[PDB]
Amino acid sequence: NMVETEPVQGCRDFPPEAMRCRRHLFDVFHATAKTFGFEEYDAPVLESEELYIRKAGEEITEQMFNFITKGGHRVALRPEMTPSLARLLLGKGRSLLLPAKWYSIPQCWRYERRREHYQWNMDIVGVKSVSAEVELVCAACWAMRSLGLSSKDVGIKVNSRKVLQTVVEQAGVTSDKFAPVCVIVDKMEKIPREEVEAQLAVLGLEPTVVDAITTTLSLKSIDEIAQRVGEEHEAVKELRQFFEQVEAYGYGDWVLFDASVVRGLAYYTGIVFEGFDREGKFRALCGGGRYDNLLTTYGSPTPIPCAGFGFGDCVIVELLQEKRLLPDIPHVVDDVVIPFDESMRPHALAVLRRLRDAGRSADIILDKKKVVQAFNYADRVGAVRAVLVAPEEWERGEVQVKMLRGFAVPLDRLV
Amino acid sequence: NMVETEPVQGCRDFPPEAMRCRRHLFDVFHATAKTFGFEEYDAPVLESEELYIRKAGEEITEQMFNFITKGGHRVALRPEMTPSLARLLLGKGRSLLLPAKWYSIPQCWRYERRREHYQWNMDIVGVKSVSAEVELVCAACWAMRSLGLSSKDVGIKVNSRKVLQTVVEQAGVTSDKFAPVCVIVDKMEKIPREEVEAQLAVLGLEPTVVDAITTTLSLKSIDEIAQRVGEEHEAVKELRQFFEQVEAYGYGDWVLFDASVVRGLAYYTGIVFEGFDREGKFRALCGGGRYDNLLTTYGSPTPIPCAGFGFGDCVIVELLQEKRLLPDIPHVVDDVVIPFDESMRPHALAVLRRLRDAGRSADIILDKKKVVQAFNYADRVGAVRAVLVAPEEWERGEVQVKMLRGFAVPLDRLV
Ligand SMILES: N[C@@H](Cc1c[nH]c[nH+]1)C(=O)O
Ligand SMILES: N[C@@H](Cc1c[nH]c[nH+]1)C(=O)O
Ligand SMILES: Nc1cccc2cnccc12
Ligand SMILES: Nc1cccc2cnccc12
């Protein structure tokens, strides 16, 4: 009987049609990274499990696709890339010249719904100032504009965790509870306030402390945060600098302040941001932030400032489909070379060689078939031109060329 | 203390330097596939284990990186791509238009030495005739020529399993032993004749039968095979057609007949081939062949002719390094925008925007630093041009431009 034609649970196949859609997306990721001066890197999908043991109750680490090798070693299919980046960065030490701007498009994994997705990662390493976050946010807007979206379709919500850090510290809560608190508060929009309030109670935070978090999360503007913490709290000056810089780059209509944005990851220390559709129909398009302590927690002797984001391949595609910005673009090829019959095949191969030699994409009809079915084939594969190689033209040093989107042409004139 | 900076056992990191080498290779794979009219596809690295249970004692299936999920399902990190391709092909059925020419560059996995490698796969589906093998072999030569190699450096050895099939059948050996026999005979060059002879004895093949295999493997030319099986054995006409066609395409100096080539995979039915360095220093550069029965064994109601090859990312790189064809090509960027000081940053961002708007790759100096260190940075990141944004030029609607591989220029003139 049949073998199982469906892919493994939660995983996608990319036959040519779907692959073209993915490549359209990835081409933008690559093109944007190049426009912004980022350098590509990669690392193994298989990493040590201990790389992701952060103990803050993170969704990303709770849903880890992990297993034990035959030699008893605890590994996982990476749930995200940032730990791999830091590993690479630590490996280089003082040999890594800074600042560094590194990007990748890893497939990342989870176990629970989809179990895999691709995630464009962009990170700036060695830059203390908000200029890093500005560039990253502009890179994300650029990718989206490149895909056909506008500031009418999407935006980027931006906040700083430092604001909340103050409230946590000032309430007497030891800072080891800060990350788990961000993690729980990250669920605030999704699940009820009672549930989030309940989760914070379990961590030992008192009712007063919880209340102070709620209020600051609901503050609707930077001037309101300034009233609460001061116009020269670390966060106020950074955010103002950030908006001033994004404005200057011409993307002011894409970004805004939102005090409810914290992200679900333990390691963010400063500015955080996430992309969203302005119709409120989809989950976050991308998300990122500054994580200045991570390399220190991995054992770096010297603190390494870092900031970056991930930008998934799934939500963006749903948005683009909704907006009618992913028309099927069929496969194309420049030339299809058609032997008049099998006796002409050697000659048609010589023609095939010349066409490809000149940088053209070209097929030759591989089967034995009638000239008209060859033309049908040429049309199906999206050929710009059909080149018929028939005995009578060949003797004259020519072929029959026909534009598809039949005049005899000398061989040398083909290209 | 430190986290483990080394990657998981047998797996490679690709920091920007190494990633550039890989991208140089992959660009050729992609460029060649496009020149030859192949369409990209992909599938999950995680496949069902049962997809690879072929029971012929294959190295590829013996060294399978497999595990059991938490839900008891037997899966594996794919040891090769061809089973995934067939799965995809079967899923499509009559909706798949033929012939089809599909390619991918999957990371493939093994457990035992390296445990991962990338493998360019190229396959032609729905083509009975040797024209498929011709195109595939030419594609492999093309990729190698594109990388800087010549027919002096490398070649492609070519054979047909049909020859050996006859000897196996004519000796009374039931055809269910044919694949395991190819598998054992594949080891002939590597391990001693005694060991290969011994492995064939264990399968129940008699001394006479073994002898007949040895002789045919050592036959040095097609005329010698013709003497043995006939000038119109299936194999003779196919091979002659194959060499005639590769000759006509202009790659005759790249290919040759070798009766010892069988490949290690169970499913090859016809022509098989493998690339090699002409100094005898390296293992096979690539390998492939026709596998007309595979889709039938997976349950296809109608036989689907297929042929293809895999071309690894490791051996080719060692060869290219030996031949001095992988010089380090440093990272480049067109422009580096340098704010004279922080007050000029908003203006420098506007300049940054314009440059990128025009399709240029551009950095802006993200840190606070002196103009000369900014220039050093520009040189380190391989900038073609440094664009200094200073207050006095700005008032005149200009910036200072300096070619690195300082004249005031109007903004509009930059691009
Ligand atoms: N790893 C984060 C994104 C990120 C990259 N760099 C910094 N943050 C995520 O998966 O959401
Ligand atoms: N899967 C084969 C190569 C191949 C692709 N298509 C046909 N053969 C290998 O790994 O060697
Ligand atoms: N959020 C996510 C993390 C890791 C892997 C994923 C796979 N599919 C969807 C979402 C994922
Ligand atoms: N031959 C091979 C098959 C599957 C995975 C591999 C990883 N590294 C080297 C060789 C491999």
Q: Residue A261 and residue A309: Cα distance in Å, rounded?
A: 14
State the best of A73, A115, A131 to mutate against chain B, taking most chain B CBs within 10 Å.
Answer: A131
Q: Which residues contact A62 (CB under 8 A, 6 or more apart)?
A: none
Would residue A321 be called left, alpha or beta, if left means φ above 0 and alpha means ψ between -120 and 50 degrees? alpha
Write out chain B residues lying below 8 Å of A51, CB-based: 3-4
Going by C-alpha positions, the residue among A374, A367, A382, A381 that lies closest to residue A400 is: A374
Q: Residue B371 and residue B349: Cα distance in Å, rounded?
A: 16
Please report the DSSP string for A33-46 in residue order.
Answer: HHHTT-EE-B--SE
Going by C-alpha positions, the residue among A67, A43, A64 that lies closest to residue A53 is: A64
CA B286–ligand 4 middle distance (angstroms):
12
Cβ atoms of B210 and B217 closer than 8 Å: no
How many other CB atoms are there within 10 angstroms of residue B141's CB atom?
25
Cβ atoms of A333 and A363 closer than 8 Å: yes
B7 touches chain A (CB under 8 A): yes
CA A312–ligand 3 middle distance (angstroms):
8
Residue spans of the domains in chain A: they are: 1-325, 326-415
Q: Indicate the residue type of B238.
A: E
Q: Which atom of ligand 1 is nearest to the CA of A121?
A: 5
Q: Residue B185 and residue B189: Cα distance in Å, rounded?
A: 8
Hey, whose CA ends up nearest to atom 7 of ligand 1? Answer: A308
What would you report as the CA-atom Rg of chain A, rounded to the nearest whole angstrom? 28
Cβ atoms of B1 and A299 closer than 8 Å: yes
Going by C-alpha positions, the residue among B13, B129, B246, B371 that lies closest to residue A44 is: B13
Is beta strand B74-77 parallel, antiparallel or unpaired with respect to B362-364? unpaired
Closest-CA distance, A247 to chain B, in angstroms, reads 8
Q: Which residues contact B71 (CB under 8 A, 6 or more apart)?
A: none
Q: Residue B214 and residue B201: Cα distance in Å, rounded?
A: 13
At B50 the three-state DSSP class reads helix
By what method was this entry solved?
A: X-ray
Is beta strand A255-257 parallel, antiparallel or unpaired with respect to A154-160? parallel
Q: Which residues contact B98 (CB under 8 A, 6 or more apart)?
A: B125, B126
A301 touches chain B (CB under 8 A): no
Going by C-alpha positions, the residue among B222, B252, B238, B270 that lies closest to residue B155 is: B252
Structure resolution in Å?
2.1
**CA A26 to chain CA centroid, nearest Å:** 8
Distances (CA, A) of A372 to A400, A404, B110: 14, 13, 47
> Which single residue is written with the structure tokens 């969203």?
A276
Q: Indicate the residue type of A207.
A: P
A1-325 and A326-415 share one CATH topology?
A: no
Q: Residue B199 and residue B57: Cα distance in Å, rounded?
A: 11
> Which single residue is written with the structure tokens 């009766």?
B259
Give me the helix-helix angle, B131-146 and B16-35, nearest 10°. Answer: 140
Cβ atoms of A75 and B8 closer than 8 Å: yes
- Chain B, residues 103-132, CB within 8 A of chain A, namely 107, 111, 116, 124, 126-129, 131-132
Element containing residue A372 per DSSP (H, E): helix A371-380
Q: Residue A265 and residue A178: Cα distance in Å, rounded?
A: 11
Cβ atoms of B288 and B307 closer than 8 Å: yes
Cβ atoms of B78 and B109 closer than 8 Å: yes
Whether residue A99 is preceded by a cis peptide bond, meaning omega within 30 degrees of 0, is yes
Q: Which residues contact B54 (CB under 8 A, 6 or more apart)?
A: B61, B179, B266, B267
Q: Indicate the residue type of A36.
A: F
Q: Residue B240 and residue B218: Cα distance in Å, rounded?
A: 19
Q: Indicate the residue type of A65.
A: F
Q: Residue B47 and residue A402: Cα distance in Å, rounded?
A: 45
Whether residue B99 is preceded by a cis peptide bond, meaning omega within 30 degrees of 0, is yes
How many other CB atoms are there within 10 angstroms of residue A281's CB atom?
10
CB contact under 8 A, B42 and A23: no
How many other CB atoms are there within 10 angstroms of residue A350's CB atom?
17
Q: Residue A5 and residue B307: Cα distance in Å, rounded?
A: 20
**Helices marked H in A219-327 — which ranges?**
222-229, 234-248, 294-297, 315-322
What would you report as the CA-atom Rg of chain B, rounded to the nearest whole angstrom? 28
Q: Residue B110 and residue B108: Cα distance in Å, rounded?
A: 7
Q: Indicate the residue type of A104.
A: S
* Torsion angles phi and psi, residue B141, rounded to 5: -65, -40
Question: Quick one: closest CA in A to B16, which residue?
Answer: A41
Cβ atoms of A227 and A205 closer than 8 Å: no
Cβ atoms of B43 and B84 closer than 8 Å: yes
Beta strands in A188-270 (DSSP E): 255-257
Cβ atoms of A84 and A47 closer than 8 Å: yes
* Torsion angles phi and psi, residue A331, rounded to 5: -60, 140
How many other CB atoms are there within 10 angstroms of residue A52's CB atom?
18
Q: Residue B124 and residue B37: Cα distance in Å, rounded?
A: 11
Going by C-alpha positions, the residue among B87, B95, B94 that lies closest to residue B51 is: B87
Q: Residue B72 and residue B378: Cα distance in Å, rounded?
A: 55
DSSP state of B188: T
3-state secondary structure A196-224: HHHHHHHCCCCHHHHHHHHHHHHCCCHHH
Q: Residue B5 and residue A90: Cα distance in Å, rounded?
A: 6
Cβ atoms of A105 and A119 closer than 8 Å: yes
DSSP state of B233: S
Of A61, A82, A186, the residue with max ligand 1 atoms within 8 A of its CB, to mutate for a pocket test, comes to A82
* Torsion angles phi and psi, residue B333, rounded to 5: -150, 150
Q: Which residues contact B179 (CB under 8 A, 6 or more apart)?
A: B54, B56, B266, B267
Going by C-alpha positions, the residue among A317, A376, A318 that lies closest to residue A24 is: A317
At A258 the three-state DSSP class reads coil
Of B62, B133, B309, B316, the residue with max ligand 2 atoms within 8 A of its CB, to mutate for a pocket test, comes to B309
Largest CA distance in chain B: 94
How many other CB atoms are there within 10 angstroms of residue B207's CB atom?
10
Residue B323 sits at the vertex; the CA angle it makes with B317 and B325, to the nearest 5 degrees, is: 65
Q: Residue A234 and residue A162: Cα distance in Å, rounded?
A: 7
How many other CB atoms are there within 10 angstroms of residue A251's CB atom?
22
Q: Residue B236 and residue B166: Cα distance in Å, rounded?
A: 12
> Which single residue is written with the structure tokens 């500015």?
A271
At B173 the three-state DSSP class reads coil
Q: Residue A252 and residue A259: Cα distance in Å, rounded?
A: 18
Q: Residue A12 and residue B390: Cα distance in Å, rounded?
A: 52
Q: Residue A386 and residue A339: Cα distance in Å, rounded?
A: 11
Length of chain B in residues, anyone?
415
Q: Residue A213 and residue A219: Cα distance in Å, rounded?
A: 10
Q: Residue B308 and residue B399: Cα distance in Å, rounded?
A: 56
How many other CB atoms are there within 10 angstroms of residue A39's CB atom?
19
CA A120–ligand 3 middle distance (angstroms):
12
Q: Residue A260 and residue A285: Cα distance in Å, rounded?
A: 16
CA A295–ligand 1 middle distance (angstroms):
14
Q: Residue A202 and residue A188: Cα distance in Å, rounded?
A: 16
**B245, two tokens:** 């066609």
Q: Residue A215 and residue B316: Cα distance in Å, rounded?
A: 61
Is beta strand A306-312 parallel, antiparallel or unpaired with respect to B383-389? unpaired
- Which value, to the nearest 10 degrees, does the dihedral of the CA atoms of residues A184, A186, A187, A193 take? 80
Q: Has domain B326-415 been given CATH number 3.40.50.800?
A: yes
Q: Which residues contact A266 (CB under 8 A, 6 or more apart)?
A: A54, A56, A58, A179, A180, A182, A183
Hey, whose CA ends up nearest to atom 11 of ligand 2? Answer: B310
Distances (CA, A) of A153 to A135, A309, B353: 21, 20, 21
At B391 the three-state DSSP class reads helix
How many other CB atoms are there within 10 angstroms of residue B337's CB atom?
30
Q: Residue A334 and residue A381: Cα distance in Å, rounded?
A: 10
CB contact under 8 A, B7 and A97: no
Largest CA distance in chain A: 94
Is beta strand A383-389 parallel, antiparallel or unpaired with respect to A333-339? parallel
A384 touches chain B (CB under 8 A): no
**CA B133 to chain CA centroid, nearest Å:** 16
CATH architecture of A1-325: 2-Layer Sandwich (3.30)
**A82, two tokens:** 């940032």
CB contact under 8 A, A47 and B8: yes
Distances (CA, A) of B142 to A20, B135, B147: 24, 10, 9
- Give strand pairing partners of B370: none
DSSP state of B42: B
- Determine whether A91 is exposed, middle or buried from the number of CB atoms within 10 Å of its CB (0-12, 13-18, 19+): middle
* Torsion angles phi and psi, residue B152, rounded to 5: -75, -30
How many other CB atoms are there within 10 angstroms of residue B74's CB atom?
12
How many other CB atoms are there within 10 angstroms of residue B218's CB atom?
11
Cβ atoms of B210 and B200 closer than 8 Å: yes
Q: Residue B403 and residue B229: Cα distance in Å, rounded?
A: 70
Distances (CA, A) of A296 to A90, A123, A267, B36, B152: 10, 17, 11, 50, 53
Q: Residue B173 and residue B209: Cα distance in Å, rounded?
A: 8
Nearest Cβ partner of B116 from A16, A44, A47? A44
Q: Indicate the residue type of A187.
A: K
**B220, two tokens:** 């040095």
- Give strand pairing partners of B102: B39, B123
Q: Residue B83 and residue A182: Cα distance in Å, rounded?
A: 45
Q: Residue A120 and residue B52: Cα distance in Å, rounded?
A: 31
